[PDB]
Amino acid sequence: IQCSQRMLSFSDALLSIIATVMILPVTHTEISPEQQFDRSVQRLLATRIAVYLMTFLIVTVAWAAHTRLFQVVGKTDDTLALLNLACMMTITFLPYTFSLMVTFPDVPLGIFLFCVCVIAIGVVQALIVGYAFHFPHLLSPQIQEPLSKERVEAFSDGVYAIVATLLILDICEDNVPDPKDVKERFSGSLVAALSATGPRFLAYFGSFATVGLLWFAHHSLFLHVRKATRAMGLLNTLSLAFVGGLPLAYQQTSAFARQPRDELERVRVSCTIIFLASIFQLAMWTTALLHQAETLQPSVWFGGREHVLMFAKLALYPCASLLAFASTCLLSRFSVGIFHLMQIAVPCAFLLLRLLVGLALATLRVL
Amino acid sequence: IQCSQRMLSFSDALLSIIATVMILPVTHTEISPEQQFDRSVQRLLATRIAVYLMTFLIVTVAWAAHTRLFQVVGKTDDTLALLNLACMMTITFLPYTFSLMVTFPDVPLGIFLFCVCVIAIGVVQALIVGYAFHFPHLLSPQIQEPLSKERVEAFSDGVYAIVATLLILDICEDNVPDPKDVKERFSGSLVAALSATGPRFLAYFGSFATVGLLWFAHHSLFLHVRKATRAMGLLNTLSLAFVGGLPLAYQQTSAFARQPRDELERVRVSCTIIFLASIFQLAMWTTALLHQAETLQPSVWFGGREHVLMFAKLALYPCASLLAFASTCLLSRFSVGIFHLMQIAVPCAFLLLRLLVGLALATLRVL
Ligand SMILES: [K+]
Ligand SMILES: [K+]
Ligand SMILES: [K+]
Ligand SMILES: [K+]
Ligand SMILES: [K+]
Ligand SMILES: [K+]
Ligand SMILES: [K+]
Numbered sequence A, B: 001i002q003c004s005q006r007m008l009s010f011s012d013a014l015l016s017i018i019a020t021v022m023i024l025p026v027t028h029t030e031i032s033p034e035q036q037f038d039r040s041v042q043r044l045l046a047t048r049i050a051v052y053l054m055t056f057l058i059v060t061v062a063w064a065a066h067t068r069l070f071q072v073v074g075k076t077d078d079t080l081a082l083l084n085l086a087c088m089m090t091i092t093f094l095p096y097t098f099s100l101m102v103t104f105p106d107v108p109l110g111i112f113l114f115c116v117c118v119i120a121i122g123v124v125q126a127l128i129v130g131y132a133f134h135f136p137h138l139l140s141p142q143i144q145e146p147l148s149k150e151r152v153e154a155f156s157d158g159v160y161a162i163v164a165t166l167l168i169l170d171i172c173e174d175n176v177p178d179p180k181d182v183k184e185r186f187s188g189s190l191v192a193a194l195s196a197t198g199p200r201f202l203a204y205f206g207s208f209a210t211v212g213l214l215w216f217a218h219h220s221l222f223l224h225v226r227k228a229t230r231a232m233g234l235l236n237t238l239s240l241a242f243v244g245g246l247p248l249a250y251q252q253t254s255a256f257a258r259q260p261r262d263e264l265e266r267v268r269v270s271c272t273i274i275f276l277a278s279i280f281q282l283a284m285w286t287t288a289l290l291h292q293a294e295t296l297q298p299s300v301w302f303g304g305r306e307h308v309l310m311f312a313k314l315a316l317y318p319c320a321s322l323l324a325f326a327s328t329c330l331l332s333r334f335s336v337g338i339f340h341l342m343q344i345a346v347p348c349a350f351l352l353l354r355l356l357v358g359l360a361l362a363t364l365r366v367l
Helices: A005-019 A021-027 A038-072 A078-091 A094-103 A109-134 A149-174 A179-185 A190-196 A198-222 A230-243 A246-254 A260-289 A307-329 A335-351 A353-366 B005-019 B021-027 B038-072 B078-091 B094-103 B109-134 B149-174 B179-185 B190-196 B198-222 B230-243 B246-254 B260-289 B307-329 B335-351 B353-366
Strands: none
Touching (some): A005 A021, A005 A038, A005 A149, A005 B149, A005 B198, A021 A094, A021 A246, A038 A078, A038 A094, A038 A109, A038 A230, A078 A109, A078 B335, A094 A109, A094 B149, A109 B190, A149 A198, A149 A230, A149 B005, A149 B021, A149 B094, A190 A198, A190 B109, A198 A246, A198 A335, A198 B078, A230 A260, A260 A335, A307 A335, A307 A353, A335 A353, B005 B021, B005 B038, B005 B078, B021 B149, B038 B078, B038 B094, B038 B109, B038 B230, B149 B198, B149 B230, B149 B246, B179 B190, B190 B198, B198 B230, B198 B246, B198 B260, B198 B307, B198 B335, B230 B260, B246 B260, B260 B307, B307 B335, B335 B353
16 A cells, blocks of 8 residues: 555656647747748647647546546556556657547548547546456445545646746757857857847747746635635636747747737737736636635634635636736837836735735725 | 645656666667677667766766755745746756766866756755744654655656656657558558567566566565665665666567577676676675664564565575576576576566465475
């Protein structure tokens, strides 16, 4: 008999890596053709984004089945650990097979391989169940629809870390000046070649800050969560899926455009992605409030000490993205500066959120 | 006041990603030139491997400083979480700056940037300390040289997951047949184009199995660990550093070579990498045995029920790699088959390890 905490943490890490595998083809796409190949580039980008979303959802369904399986199976052992490794190996093949099926939709080999992967996952899970039931001491006591907050938290943390580090990974792999280009194309100067790679650094900074503040909000929320439901899990899955597109949005924003219309368009798209990623966390919080007694600590109840602070922490990014979108639409001349100042300010708001909340409550007070 | 478990898990995930960032240039290197560019390819590969090892060690030192910092700082809060995000952002720049310093060793800007990153990490940590000491309730009770097993476990799990999924990530990103090459270069056949990518799939299978069994050994060992020491942490760091080179080894082995001498050489290199990665875990176990009372559960003491089983679980891979190396050296004609059969057998040995241990103990018994 062994504790299964670390095995499930390892599984969560693997599954988080496998769910974000199809976002690299998205962030590795052509920024812009620059010869007006505009039609076929956005097409491929949209197809890649659809494939990413579908693969994320499928791997999340697999992860949820795994969580239920090892909620009915309490303690693990050597054989169960090896079978779980086999299950992880099976799951690792879902993105490749799905991409193959949606790339070659006419030949039956792709759907065949997809269904084979699925059936193999199911067979490994059934073997785990059979082993656990042949040895009753490996079953949870109640055996001998709330999700496990542990697994949700670990999975979300992994997704957030990957999405926050994508751009720095790509930088460190590719954007390191080579001496030849330095003292040939830049007239013997390393500082020049490094400044040439400034846009990517600013994109990484923005993406890391945004993803880290969204993780901060998620962490503050789930510190007060008692029982995670399936609806909250769905909303968290949607939030995480839309969190993966922040690196692409920041890449497009920081990149210089041809004419300001594309500037406004890219700012709009980035604000939309942020708004979705954040409004789904806000929806998680409201769905939990629907049943606060069996879902939330009394601190964040209707009338609790930390209720308004949590509302603000979770509604900060959505309101900012909405205001930036309204800027893009109406003003339409100071939109980029508004977006950049919000990039810089939202963090300072998170840092001074308690002071601002008190000031605003006093404002409501004596008026 | 908030619990800091999830913040530190997130930090461990980020740091594990950042420590394995320089292994991608290694696994993305030319397999072989095929026109006898042999000299300058192995040179660049060795330089990349050295850079990877150095960056891994530096990020591990940063991670250890972080662990000590948040061992003296018990509970976290919003400000501490944001400052920790800043510290993570700082650490994320260590690999890039070190690669820049070792690439341009003559100009002083590289070492300048490296030292700037280091000083920024230190300043953020000093700010965290100052905040925690200005608010005593954020200090651990004993404040108001053993490492934390929690952080070691999380960091190791992240490294293991990344190293086990590298090759499948690269496959799903690049090795997905495109219809043109399928019905042009393969004479209208998807199965042919998929079989052409078989070597990479076999490499991924082998790497995943090996890394998962090494994680299995690590997990079994640290299930019985009470107090992790600094020596055990050093040995684990070395083991993890040498675990990152398994994907490259399997890539080279599964790839077809020009003449069998390179076959034997690649088998030797792979066996050596496995031997190091595993002998350092064995050394962890022996160093713990040095002080079993204050380091190990009584189950794995000298004379415990699960002592010999742990010895076998940890000495299985080293002995197998050593036997395969001796095969390469002496026999030298059946070495590849021996290596492949060991790839297939070591898992079955792990699965039936208890039966084999009992059989061998009886063998020792009545002889
Ligand atoms: K975890
Ligand atoms: K993770
Ligand atoms: K990762
Ligand atoms: K990645
Ligand atoms: K953890
Ligand atoms: K991890
Ligand atoms: K990676």
